[PDB]
Design a protein around this ligand. Structure first.
Ligand SMILES: Cc1cc2nc3c(=O)[nH]c(=O)nc-3n(C[C@H](O)[C@H](O)[C@H](O)COP(=O)(O)OP(=O)(O)OC[C@H]3O[C@@H](n4cnc5c(N)ncnc54)[C@H](O)[C@@H]3O)c2cc1C
Ligand SMILES: Cc1cc2nc3c(=O)[nH]c(=O)nc-3n(C[C@H](O)[C@H](O)[C@H](O)COP(=O)(O)OP(=O)(O)OC[C@H]3O[C@@H](n4cnc5c(N)ncnc54)[C@H](O)[C@@H]3O)c2cc1C
Ligand SMILES: CCCCCC[C@H]1C(=O)O[C@H](C)[C@H](NC(=O)c2cccc(NC=O)c2O)C(=O)O[C@@H](C)[C@@H]1OC(=O)CC(C)C
Ligand SMILES: CCCCCC[C@H]1C(=O)O[C@H](C)[C@H](NC(=O)c2cccc(NC=O)c2O)C(=O)O[C@@H](C)[C@@H]1OC(=O)CC(C)C
Lengths: 547, 551
């Protein structure tokens, strides 16, 4: 649907039919029938929240139920442009609902603003191209009328990637790709799919599975995030150990820029023809052009899958076990190491951690793989905690972002963030980042100590991906968004000073801009600028992400 | 050694001590003791050469005996620059011999000219930095005095990437990285090695082995090719199915550009921090700066290695089997499918012996896993009519790896011009591309009046999810042909046109250099090409890195 508010929340994650509410029995439960925890009462959840954040659940916050249309800036757009746009039959909207839906990602700041304030700037017009040639016309129009374009796909960005710069005086088009969503074809001999960039991941897998195929790329946002999004942000997913990350999955792509269309002439698997121009575009975050089409690898649907789980004496032993697993290059499809606090949350001794596992592929090969991993983990005090437990521990994957909305209903601001680091920095980085979060919250006037946990979510030869989760009761803090912002940016500084990356997969957008030049060196930065100024000399792709 | 020609050949591949010759018994043999095949007579080789190319092995070709300093252009070099350079103690040389050694790689055309002629242009001075800070001083000086720098590592380019543009009128520095060759350190905890970019593959693997580690990156030029070279040309190696290719191995890198030092601030395994600047350097072919250092992944030395081999009814069945192996993601460490003509050559040293094709295999890693892998691969191969042909036949199938380039020098002593080229292609193009390219080569030869039909064979060399790497081998008897290089040059160009028209890439691993520039813009789009050009003009605005590769 073009009117996204029809099915999806204008002011939070996901579908209108799916939210946490207090049932007849006074227990927490997700509305709808969409997820395997939809309609499943969670008896202890309420107490966990009381005791963790120190609240009743007496006073719900009150927030906007709809856009307030008196607060939405006016849609400024040229008539001659509009006149030419009319002739193309490219569908468009100047309605405030449509324009506000596409002015934001799913960063905390943005969500909180939707519920309480309004945006400084939002697009002036929304266009829904349906194919590559529409995107060619739009881009040509935008050159002709000095327009600005900000592509959006899923709108799942967590980096201020879609945010309209406040002092951008030109007409901002939101170039929405949701209608450019066909599987053009499956190539069964080469095992690739030629797709349009607006297809969502849920819809990509659904279609391919009708022919017996999958991509196996499974970011947590896959119900809404798109092929073009993934390429633009260097997305990563849960089973990258078998299937690869987006840089491993993309065989070919087509891109529209002000200068013309970028495309390689060949679809061969690996080349040496200079600096790989695919990597000039991957991670380009809407700044260079529109990714219209991509060829992506596919695989037969896996024959078998099996969950598993392991208890360790403590986090540090789990990390050493994960390190050993990587060293033997025998990481399962997924492996996550959860700290004690998260093990406690999942339980509804104070040191133990739990790893969850998912094996998939051939039945025989899964079972061998499984014996290998358990035998490794034995040597770090790790004990098999059961197959159904491991499954239980992937049940929350697609409901977590609905928990964040639940918390905003009761004065709790929460957010996750992430990094990758060398294996020899992981232990220190986890400890010191968590401590910097608490120290900052104490020092900013926060009553209870925050929820501050961590988890190891991917292993690599050279290190691991680490997720942090941060939440706090903000009730009667003066400026509760400045405190979040300040603490998040402090957590980021800490990450960098402990040998962490600026981002493993969320990207940079405008949220992490300030650290990029240091991350990639001044010359690196200047090389990015040179490609921008050649490809987009008047800054038509004006989201101002990155540089 | 700074004076490379003391140990290595000035006009050819490899070591002065290793060359094919006719022994006391009139049989071909490789001299010295470097390779398993050194000092091992090849009784049938001489006859295969005669039958294949239609020549007697009596009339030797008469080549230039030695590097003539007088044949070279004079070394012209601003004196103030020279004064400045002496103060730094960086070793340097203006001697003809050193300059000519670093004026070329190993394209057939460059070797031919070495043997019978002289290059239109050669570096004016050779510098030997020993470390990163040295390279900074040199580039700073090259900026100041308007010098053109052409980096050199092993000198093993097959893309005219070291060739000095003929109309370049500035002083050309050859910046030789061979003395900048330390393993700076091994990080056993992250499994990475921080190395200087002039270290060779042989020397890197030898030092790592001493601690029980390897990279497992094994290009066929590994005796002489360097870390900086691999990065600059996107090199690929034999066991890339296990270890990865250069873009999978490199975790970090340091590059000296005229604009300053490029370097990421962290060494995390994988980031999302915009377009990946390592891919701006990898494949840059000396056009942007000098790669000084890199951090490369290492592994523990494998527990166990084992060869194998399979014979298929024909090539096409062999290809379907490799495709099936790739589909099941069970490629062994190395797998190569050789066409029938190559099986005969190997043979000469109820299946039909002039249609059958042969695969060589190398498995490596844990004992148990090797065994499991070997079952799976032989089980798939049996579905395509594939029958296990023996471990020792497999091993023999890998003996020629480091000696084929010496065989080329041999051919040139007897009026035989040979070269290899490579591409990669989607799976559904492999069979036709193989057929059409070989035929194209036969046909182009015939039409330019080549007496005997050339050697024109092929080999599938690497498998990927999305396709394969293909090598073609081309050689012909050139006796009498009025202009043999022009015949070779055109036939090569035409095979490349064929490759491109049958869905193949411009290159899998050799790169573009100046030899394949004419097709780059079409391979990558004008806008693509423009992006490469923008980066060049930012990083190197006065074109110090003047080799003119790519653009
Ligand atoms: C709850 C939740 C879970 C998440 N889980 C993951 C995860 O597991 N892994 C992961 O990598 N990320 C995750 N994300 C982040 C986000 O889903 C990814 O960054 C995703 O790749 C963005 O896809 P999208 O289609 O939503 O892009 P959008 O948010 O629409 O856009 C992202 C950026 O790309 C640009 N863009 C979008 N489409 C195009 C195009 N066709 N051409 C050019 N530019 C374009 C936009 O201008 C913007 O700058 C998560 C986010 C949330 C909120
Ligand atoms: C017999 C033979 C076998 C081969 N086998 C293989 C193979 O298996 N796989 C494969 O990929 N290739 C192969 N090649 C090609 C060649 O060895 C590779 O391209 C190799 O990467 C070149 O490394 P080198 O150190 O010899 O570089 P050189 O030839 O010295 O330089 C190559 C290019 O890189 C630039 N350069 C070199 N060092 C630096 C640096 N430090 N910084 C910046 N630029 C630099 C040069 O200016 C030049 O443009 C082979 C070549 C031959 C002759
Ligand atoms: C940006 C969205 C993240 C918001 C951060 C806050 C949430 C957060 O910390 O999420 C984590 C993902 C955490 N999980 C686990 O411990 C966990 C443990 C065992 C097994 C699994 N197995 C999944 O299959 C687990 O997932 C979790 O569920 O805690 C929620 C309850 C938090 O919500 C909050 O209290 C604050 C919210 C209510 C505002
Ligand atoms: C450097 C580029 C060479 C240019 C092509 C010429 C050479 C060429 O075709 O190489 C191929 C690699 C070929 N091999 C095989 O058939 C082969 C077959 C079975 C097993 C293996 N297993 C290796 O362990 C094989 O390798 C070969 O050895 O034929 C040489 C003889 C050719 O030399 C010449 O004719 C030029 C000169 C001698 C006249």
């Amino acid at each position: 649907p073009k009117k996204r508010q029809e099915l999806m929340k204008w002011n939070g994650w996901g579908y209108n039919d799916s939210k946490f509410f207090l049932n007849k029995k006074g227990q927490l439960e997700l509305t709808g029938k969409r997820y395997p925890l939809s309609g499943v009462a969670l008896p202890t959840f309420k107490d966990w929240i009381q005791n963790t954040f120190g609240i009743n659940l007496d006073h719900k916050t009150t927030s906007k139920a709809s856009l307030n249309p008196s607060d939405t800036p006016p849609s400024i757009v040229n008539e001659d442009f509009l006149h030419e746009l009319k002739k193309t039959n490219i569908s468009y909207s100047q309605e405030a609902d449509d324009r506000v839906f596409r002015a934001h990602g799913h960063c905390l700041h943005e969500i909180f603003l939707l519920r309480e304030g309004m945006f400084e700037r939002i697009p002036d017009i929304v266009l829904w191209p349906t194919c590559h040639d529409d995107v060619v016309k739009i881009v040509n129009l935008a050159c002709k009328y000095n327009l600005c374009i900000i592509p959006i796909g899923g709108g799942t960005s967590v980096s201020y990637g879609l945010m309209c710069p406040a002092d951008e005086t030109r007409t901002i088009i939101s170039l929405d790709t949701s209608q450019m969503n066909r599987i053009l074809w499956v190539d069964e001999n080469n095992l690739t799919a030629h797709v349009e960039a607006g297809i969502t991941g849920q819809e990509l897998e659904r279609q391919l599975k009708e022919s017996g195929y999958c991509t196996g790329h499974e970011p947590d946002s896959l119900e809404f995030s798109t092929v073009g999004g993934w390429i633009s942000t260097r997305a990563s997913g849960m089973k990258k150990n078998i299937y690869g990350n987006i840089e491993d999955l993309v065989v070919h792509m087509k891109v529209v820029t002000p200068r013309g269309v970028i495309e390689k002439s060949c679809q061969g698997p690996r080349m040496s023809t200079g600096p790989d121009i695919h990597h000039f575009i991957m991670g380009s975050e809407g700044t260079l052009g529109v990714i219209t089409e991509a060829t992506i690898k596919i695989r037969p649907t896996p024959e078998y899958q099996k969950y598993g789980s392991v208890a360790f004496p403590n986090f540090e032993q789990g990390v050493a076990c994960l390190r050993e697993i990587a060293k033997q290059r025998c990481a399962p499809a997924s492996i996550r190491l959860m700290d004690n606090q998260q093990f406690q949350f999942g339980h509804a001794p104070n040191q133990l951690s739990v790893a969850t596992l998912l094996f998939e592929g051939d039945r025989e090969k899964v079972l061998q793989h499984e014996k290998q991993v358990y035998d490794i983990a034995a040597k770090f005090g790790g004990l098999a905690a059961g197959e159904d437990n491991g499954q239980r521990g992937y049940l929350l994957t697609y409901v977590i972002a609905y928990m964040r909305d639940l918390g905003l209903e009761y004065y709790i601001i929460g957010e996750s963030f992430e990094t990758s680091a060398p294996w020899d920095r992981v232990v220190d980085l986890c400890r010191n980042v968590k401590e910097r979060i608490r120290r900052e919250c104490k020092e900013k006037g926060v009553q209870f100590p925050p929820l501050s946990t961590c988890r190891v979510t991917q292993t690599y030869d050279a290190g691991a991906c680490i997720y942090f989760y941060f939440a706090f009761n903000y009730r009667g803090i003066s400026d509760p968004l400045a405190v979040f912002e300040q603490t998040e940016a402090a957590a980021r500084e800490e990450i960098l000073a402990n040998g962490g990356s600026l981002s493993h997969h969320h990207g940079v957008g405008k949220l992490r801009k300030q650290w990029l030049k240091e991350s990639i060196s001044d010359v690196g930065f200047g090389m990015l600028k040179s490609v921008k100024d050649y490809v987009d000399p008047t800054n038509i792709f004006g989201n101002r992400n990155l540089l």
